[PDB]
């Protein structure tokens, strides 16, 4: 007699899948829907170079911290890299008001050229600009300060009413930062700014606030008993920004021509940066997969898979592998 058995194939494969009826069953072939592998490098997202602040945070890069000179900003970036040990940010004590959403807006910028709305050489004739360097912001030993801001002093024995406006003429949202100094003592207040009471009004077509010092002795942070409170706004492509102050103003030396592109986030990791081509990027490591699910990290930026808690997500494309 002859034989025409109908059967399925088996192999030496030991891949295991789980069904509702039976778990830990071997299959001949399977595909992993759970990408558990990452290159471990913060590589390029979309097609442009992600920003790396190194030993800096957003409050230090944008302010112009002396420890942020190593980084380069030239073109669009898809996300911002910070080391978890990055503490070289705001080197003067204080709270950066509206901080986290400024971090969110500045996460991805299509057109960022760091230009100079007010040149230090000529834009402030009647005020002293060289004295605004602090021992709380060292660059190399000696006292330094933010490059992107000038912290003004009365020149001689008077602080005249500063009034200087920037008519935006670049077609992009000019991002502006300024500071308001809060001295520890009223003697410090007068000896820095001749006026005892000092309003700082900053106006725009859409944003208007008045700022006043809060003069009292704080506990020492970074060997400083006073705080230095920072503000920012987005100047629209055709409107104005009026800067008015009779004291306690840290003018923008450098503003930042900005054009937001769809928004992104900030990745905080120790991971080194290399040049790759990755659709998804996690702090642990960049992934290029079309696979629907991941388990590397919840915080992900890009066209990323969904983060799950599973460990065995395999579709059992092959049959039940029952060898012999």
């Amino acid at each position: 007699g002859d034989t025409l058995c109908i059967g399925y194939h088996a192999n030496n494969s030991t891949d295991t899948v789980d069904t509702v009826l039976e778990k830990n069953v071997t299959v001949t072939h399977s595909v992993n829907l759970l990408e558990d592998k990452h290159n471990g490098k913060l590589c390029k997202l979309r097609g442009v170079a992600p920003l790396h602040l190194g030993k800096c945070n957003i409050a230090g890069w944008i302010l112009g911290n002396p420890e942020c000179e190593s980084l380069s900003t030239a073109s669009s970036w898809s996300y911002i890299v910070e080391t978890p040990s990055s503490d070289n940010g705001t080197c003067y004590p204080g709270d950066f008001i509206d901080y986290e959403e400024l971090r969110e807006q500045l996460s991805s910028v299509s057109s960022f050229e760091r230009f100079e709305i007010f040149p230090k050489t000529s834009s402030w004739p009647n005020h002293d600009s060289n004295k605004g360097v602090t021992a709380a912001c060292p660059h190399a030993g000696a006292k330094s300060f933010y490059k992107n801001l000038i912290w003004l002093v009365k020149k001689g024995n008077s602080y005249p009413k500063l009034s200087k406006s920037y008519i935006n003429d670049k077609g992009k949202e000019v991002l502006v930062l300024w500071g308001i100094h809060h001295p520890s003592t009223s003697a410090d207040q007068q000896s820095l700014y001749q006026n005892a009471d000092t309003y700082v009004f900053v106006g725009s077509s859409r944003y208007s606030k008045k700022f006043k010092p809060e003069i009292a002795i704080r506990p020492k942070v970074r060997d400083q008993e006073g705080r230095m409170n920072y503000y920012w706004t987005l100047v629209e492509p055709g409107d104005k920004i009026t800067f008015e102050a009779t004291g306690n103003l840290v003018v923008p030396r450098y503003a930042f021509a900005m054009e937001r592109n769809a928004g992104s986030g900030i990745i905080i990791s120790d991971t080194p940066v290399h040049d790759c081509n990755t659709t998804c990027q996690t702090p642990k490591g960049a992934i290029n997969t079309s696979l629907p699910f991941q388990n590397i990290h919840p915080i992900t930026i890009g066209k990323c898979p969904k983060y799950v808690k599973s460990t065995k997500l395999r579709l059992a494309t092959g049959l039940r592998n029952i060898p012999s």
Partner: antibody
Amino acid sequence: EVQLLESGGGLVQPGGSLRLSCAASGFTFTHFAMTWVRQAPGKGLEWVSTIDGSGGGTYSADFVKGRFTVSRDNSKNTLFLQMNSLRAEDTALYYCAKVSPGMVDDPHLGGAFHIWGQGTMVTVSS
Amino acid sequence: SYELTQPPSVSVAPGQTATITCGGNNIGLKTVHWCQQKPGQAPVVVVYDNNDRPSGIPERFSGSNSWNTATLTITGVEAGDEADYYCQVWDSGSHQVVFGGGTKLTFL
């Protein structure tokens, strides 16, 4: 112009007292922190005590051991200093200096002594 | 606590760069107010900060604070540069003013 002035004492035995003053004129006196610095005749400068412009928080050196206390009078535009002479090593020319406005850190106190007063001899010895 | 040490004297040839040093602890994070004293005179400030010069004082007087030492780097010594050069700093930690012994430099 800013003209800091001096007044001191000639000679007092260890166990006596004498009065120093710095009658500043020519500027807004309330808002600059006055000092006192001395030097031995042929030795480097050494600081005695600063004062705050408000007349409150006072700072002084380590050689005083609590004896020397600078006091500030804003109303008459004149600074006062306590020489309660108890030791014979305090022979010097006594200068009062004005702290110019500082640069960010320690503005009222950590500033250059642009206007240096002259020196009144104060010698203590048996 | 905070200590300032300077050379007792610094030798220099006429017209050659004269360097005056006020060493100590990390004086970089600290404002140095250089001031010279001629015999029978009061301290006239020549560099009232890290690096900036007052008016009425010739340009050659310069200063550059560094990691541990301040340097009143005079670019060219002449007959009017023989004096004792003190360094004055306000110590933030202990709230003091500390001078130094100074350099009695001679242009020879």
